[PDB]
């Protein structure tokens, strides 16, 4: 047979395409530190999309300097509380949690997620982790953070989302001392990400239910006379005669959307503190208006409105320092027109 060649329908890189096991995206890897101590991650909630007219500053671009309209995505990012400081012991098997110390003072809203840890072993847990770091059992220190969505009116929930955010420093003693400084406090997103720097956005994408193979893998609809013979949105064949089994690589129906996905090199364009700077007339559609401090991310982001978005500094950022942007116009006209 003179074979006609087509690339495989869909990607096997994201299988098994199942429902993600949490509403919070999780980071499997963290970038190596390149400077002063700081949290490597922040968490916000996606409000919606608008567009800005920013002067182009991207070096070597065709349209450098001239006006462009960049679709941005406003993200509502209030302060987060660094709840716990957790140290890990590395061995042949892998990293293992060796000890934790929780902050003495914590928000009352945390009870809806977990029962409130008492203000007990604060100095003694810290000295135990210090001794563990001194003897050499400790390899890395991470901070536990939660959002405080009680302020946000567009997000219906008031329970925090707890997640781990690695500290970015050089020496494990340095990481421990910075974590001691920031433990139990509220750190705004300006203390993590700077204006104009790339990040990575992870979030559980928009669930689309149990979708078919034509939408799930983009397979071909039956064409011509075959379009009306009884199988239009069905895959043509599930396998050969041998091997006598359906492969896992055949397109088929199943859970589409609501997967965890990571987007690289999502630039930050603005670090705002008043929601009236970006909230359009009539508010956002199905959200409301912005009431906290926000960040404007260039381009799209996985997930719908109100979804938790995890922001970390980039892990494969090709480009150098990009500088501050020059926004000429944040388009706050109505999204409903």
């Amino acid at each position: 047979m003179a074979s006609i060649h087509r690339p495989k329908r869909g990607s096997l890189a994201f299988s098994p395409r199942k429902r993600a096991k949490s509403h919070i995206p999780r980071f499997r890897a963290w970038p190596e530190a390149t400077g002063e101590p700081k949290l490597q991650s922040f968490a916000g909630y996606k409000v919606g999309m608008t567009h800005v007219i920013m002067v182009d500053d991207t070096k070597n671009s065709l349209t450098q300097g001239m006006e462009i309209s960049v679709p941005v995505t406003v993200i509502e990012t209030p302060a987060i509380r660094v709840a716990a400081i957790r140290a890990y012991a590395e061995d042949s098997t892998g990293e293992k949690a060796i000890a934790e110390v929780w902050a003495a003072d914590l928000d009352p809203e945390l009870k809806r997620r977990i029962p409130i840890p008492a203000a007990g072993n604060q100095a003694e847990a810290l000295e135990n982790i210090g001794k563990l770091i001194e003897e050499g059992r400790v390899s890395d220190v991470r901070a536990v953070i939660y959002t405080l969505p009680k302020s946000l009116t567009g997000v219906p929930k008031k329970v925090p989302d707890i997640m781990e955010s690695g500290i970015s420093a050089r020496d494990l003693g340095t990481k421990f001392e910075y974590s001691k400084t920031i433990l139990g406090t509220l750190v705004s997103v300006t203390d993590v990400f700077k204006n104009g720097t790339l990040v990575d956005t992870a979030a559980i994408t928009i669930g689309k239910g149990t979708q078919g193979p034509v939408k799930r893998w983009g397979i071909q609809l039956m064409k011509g006379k075959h379009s009306r013979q009884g199988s239009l949105r069905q895959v043509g064949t599930l396998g050969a005669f041998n091997p006598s089994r359906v492969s896992w690589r055949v397109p088929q129906m199943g859970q589409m959307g609501y997967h965890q996905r990571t987007e690289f090199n999502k630039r930050i364009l603005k670090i705002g503190s008043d929601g009236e700077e970006v909230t359009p007339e009539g508010g956002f559609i199905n959200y409301g208006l912005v009431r906290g401090d926000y960040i404007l991310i260039k381009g799209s982001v996985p997930g719908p409105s109100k979804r938790l978005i995890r922001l970390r500094d980039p892990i494969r950022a090709k480009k150098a320092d990009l500088g501050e942007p020059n926004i000429l116009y944040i388009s706050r006209e109505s999204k409903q027109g």
């Binding site: 006609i4 060649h5 087509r6 690339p7 007219i53 462009i68």
Partner: protein, 132 residues
């Protein structure tokens, strides 16, 4: 070729007959293939604004007719967007007859021409009077 500044959808595909709007003598030319376009399976060769195309003259003079020439499409009804966010569209499609490198065969181009093809093929820009 050189990257334009605006995103252009590939509206026209193979078999389309487009009003050739130069004084080359060819009136209607059918798109046979598109230079610098490797396809995929079952996909017709599509050509948006600023693409060089292999065309066969369908209507025109007796000497231009039935030839296989190189043409550049200069207008399209399928709207494209400028870098500033505005979408631009034209009342009709149109292509001019050119060479491999971009030099038109004709001397004047009737009607408007998109500014992207003027910035890519500067001879097409200079030869045409009104540019949009």
């Amino acid at each position: 070729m050189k990257g334009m500044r605006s995103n252009i959808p590939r509206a026209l595909n193979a078999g389309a007959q487009i009003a050739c709007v130069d004084n080359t003598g060819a009136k209607v030319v059918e798109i046979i293939s598109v230079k610098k376009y490797r396809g995929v399976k079952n996909r017709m060769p599509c050509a948006g604004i600023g693409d060089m195309c292999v065309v066969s003259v369908k209507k025109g003079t007796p000497e231009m007719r039935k030839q296989v020439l190189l043409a550049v499409v200069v207008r399209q009804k399928q709207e494209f967007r400028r870098p500033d966010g505005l979408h631009v569209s034209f009342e009709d499609n149109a292509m001019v007859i050119t060479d491999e490198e971009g030099i038109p065969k004709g001397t004047d181009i009737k009607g408007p021409v998109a500014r992207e093809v003027a910035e890519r093929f500067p001879k097409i820009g200079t030869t045409a009077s009104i540019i949009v």
